[model samples]
Target: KLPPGWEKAMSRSSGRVYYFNHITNASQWERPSGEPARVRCSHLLVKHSQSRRPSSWRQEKITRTKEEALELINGYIQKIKSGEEDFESLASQFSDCSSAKARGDLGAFSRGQMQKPFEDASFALRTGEMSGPVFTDSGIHIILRTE
Candidate 1:
C-alpha cells in the first residue's frame, strides 16, 4: 500500500512526474587481479525509505505486476507512436508519478541519482521523441522525451 498522504500530495502537485520500476541487469564486483579475493554483490541503488518517493528523486510507482502494468504503459506508447497523443497529455492521464499532474516532468538529475537503466533510456531520448514500450521488472515503460 502507498504511504499515508501520498495520494493527497500527488493530487496537489503542479509538476509532472513518472513512476517506473527501474531494474538493473548489470553486474559489479570488487576484486584484485592476480590474487584470490572475495567479491561482494551490491545493488547500485539502495532503498533509503519505505516510501516510493526518494528524497532527491521524483515520484514513481512501484507496481506489483509487470504484465498488467506493461499493458497500460504500452497503450500510451502506441498512442504516442501513432501521433494521436502528445507526450505531456498522455503522461497526465497515464503516468504514475506525482508529477503526472505536470505531465511526467522530472526535474534535472545528475549521475547516480537515477537507476542506471532509467537514466540510460531517459537520456537516450531526444526532445519530443516517444519510445515504444520497454520492459523492466516493474513493468513496461512509455518513455516520452520532454527535454
Candidate 2:
C-alpha cells in the first residue's frame, strides 16, 4: 500500500495502477514522483541579527545570533512534530514574519515569487506536510504546506 494521504487504485481499462493524492487533489497514471506547480503554505520565520534584514514585526532591533535563532526554530519544530503545539498558534506567537499576524499564512503562490531556498522547500512538501529548518536570506524557517 502507499503512504498515508495517498489512495492507490487500478484503472479498469488498462489494469494499471494509478495514484491519487487526496490532500492536493491530484492524480496521475504512475506513482507520484514530483510535486505540484502551485502550492499554499504557511511558515514560521526566525530572524537573527545576521539576517539580510533583521527587523521584524515581532521586534524592532533583532539581537539574537544565528545559532540562537536556529535553536529556537528547532525547538518549535520539536513541539510541532510531537503534536504538543499547534503550528498556527506557535507561529502567531513566535514567527518573525509579518504573515504571523495571519497565523503565518502565505496563501497560494507559484515558484519564483519567494526566495529560492524557501520556494524549493515549499515545493518539496506534500499537502498537509510541514518542513524542518530551511535557511533563507530572511532567516531560518519552518514551512507547512496547507494545500
Candidate 3:
C-alpha cells in the first residue's frame, strides 16, 4: 500500500507522474514512506440533529436531519472528486468539526483513539485516497487519508 496522504497524479506540463500530499498540500516526484498501523487523515464532518453533540463552529444549533447531512456530504465528495473544489478550502469553510480551523487536519493518529467506523475507514484508505461518506455517531464524514 502507498504511504498515507500521498497520491499519484499526472502532470499536465510534462505528462509525467507526480506525487501529491493532501495533508501538506504539496507535490513531489519521490514516493513517501509509512508505518504499519499508523496513519494520518483529514475529514470534513457534517453533524446532523442526531449527532452526539450536534453543535458546531458553523452553527450554534444543528437542525439538519441525518439524511440531510448525508446528502450534503455526498455533494461535497462529488465536488472534490470532480476537481470543482479544493478539499482544504471546503473543509475549512464548512466542516462541522473544530478541526476545520486546521483545514480538517487530524494529524497522525493510531488505532483506538477514534470511534470504530471512523478509525476503520481511515486505516482502510491508501495514501492519497479519499473515502465516501461514512456514518458515525458524530455525523456523516468524508475522510481523506493524508499521512
Candidate 4:
C-alpha cells in the first residue's frame, strides 16, 4: 500500500512495491506480515436492458431513458435497500435476465467473469445494499448486494 493514496491505482507484482489509489475496497493481496486476505461479497442482479448485445445499439433501440429507467426501477431498488422488498420479488418483477425463474441468482463470481464496471461495482458493496445503476455495453443494471 502506498501510504494512504496509491495515486494511479496501479501496481506491479506483489513482491515488488505495491500501489493503490484509495482504500475503497479490501485488499485481496496477502498482508506483508503474512496475515491472510479478508474480504467477502456476493451480489444478485436485475438488468434493465436496452439491447441484447453491444452491436445492437441503434437510435431507434434505446428503451427507457435513464430517467425512465429510474422511474420504472427505483421503487424496487428503494424497497430492497430500505428492507421492504426482497431480491426474489424484485428480480422476478424487474430483472430482464433469464434468472427470473430463480429470482435473479446469477450466483457469485470472482473477477474476470463479468464486465469490468459491473464487477467493480459489485465488489464495492456491503451486505443487502443496492447500487443505483451500472453502465455496460448492453445496458446499466440494478445491482443487489445479497450478503
Note the Cα lDDT for every prediction shown.
0.43, 0.83, 0.84, 0.51
What is the lDDT ranking, best to worst? 3, 2, 4, 1
Model 3 per-residue lDDT tens digits across residues 1-147: 676566899999999998875543445666755645789999999999999997998999999999899889878877897799999999999999999999999998899999888887788676886776778899988888987
lDDT of 2 by residue, 2-61 (tens): 644568878889899887654333345666543577999999999999889989988999
Clashing pairs in 2: none
lDDT of 4 by residue, 1-147 (tens): 333323332245445443232322222232222011222333333233444542221232444554565565656656766788886787766565556556766666776777777766666654554555566654556666564
* Candidate 1 residue spans exceeding 4 A from truth: 1-64, 135-139
What TM-score, computed on C-alpha atoms, does each candidate reach? 0.50, 0.76, 0.76, 0.55
- Evaluate model 4: give its lDDT: 0.51
Clashes of each: 9, 0, 3, 1
lDDT of 2 at 96: 96
The 10 consecutive residues of candidate 1 with the worst lDDT sum are: 35-44
Error of 1 at 79 (Å): 1.1
Candidate 1 global TM-score: 0.50
